[PDB]
Design a protein around this ligand. Structure first.
Ligand SMILES: [Ca+2]
Ligand SMILES: [Ca+2]
Ligand SMILES: [Ca+2]
Ligand SMILES: [Ca+2]
Lengths: 138, 22
């Protein structure tokens, strides 16, 4: 299920999306995030993404809506894996993850990053391969 | 950190791809 440490972690994850700290994620904020991860959703796509997680229909995502979403195919996971595996070599390194997190406006110690890698890593080689990435999601 | 951040970014990416048009 769901620990207070995880709720804490999802609460800081939400802050990566909620750029202005006003407590909601707007279509504009989501667009910014998505472009920082190399994507280019239209205005209507961003509204679609918002409206799917927007439980109360108010046009923005609050933390309870975000947390709910987080409580919970081939191509989407592969597509996401390629966002992190910047050099295409099949392995997410700590430095590739560092880079992704810095693009999202998040300066992390080399230790924090290594724990993220460590938690996803299954075989212990210090990197995240595609099969390990698939498992993390599921 | 751990999987929650990693998963959060990953799940939003999934959203992108599951929601595209033409
Ligand atoms: Ca906001
Ligand atoms: Ca809402
Ligand atoms: Ca790589
Ligand atoms: Ca590994």
């Amino acid at each position: 299920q769901l620990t207070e440490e995880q709720i804490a972690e999802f609460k800081e994850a939400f802050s990566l999306f909620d750029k202005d700290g006003d407590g909601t994620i707007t279509t504009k904020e989501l667009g910014t995030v998505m472009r920082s991860l190399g994507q280019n959703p239209t205005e209507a796509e961003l509204q679609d993404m918002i409206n799917e997680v927007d439980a109360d229909g108010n046009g923005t995502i609050d933390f309870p809506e975000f947390l709910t979403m987080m409580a919970r195919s081939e191509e989407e996971i592969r597509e996401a894996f390629r966002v992190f595996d910047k050099d295409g070599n099949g392995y997410i390194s700590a430095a590739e993850l560092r880079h992704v997190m810095t693009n999202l406006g998040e300066k992390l110690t080399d230790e924090e990053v290594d724990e993220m890698i460590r938690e996803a890593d299954i075989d212990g080689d210090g990197q995240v391969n595609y099969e390990e990435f698939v498992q993390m999601m599921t | 950190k751990k999987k929650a951040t990693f998963r959060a970014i990953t799940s939003t990416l999934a959203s992108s791809f599951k929601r595209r048009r033409s």
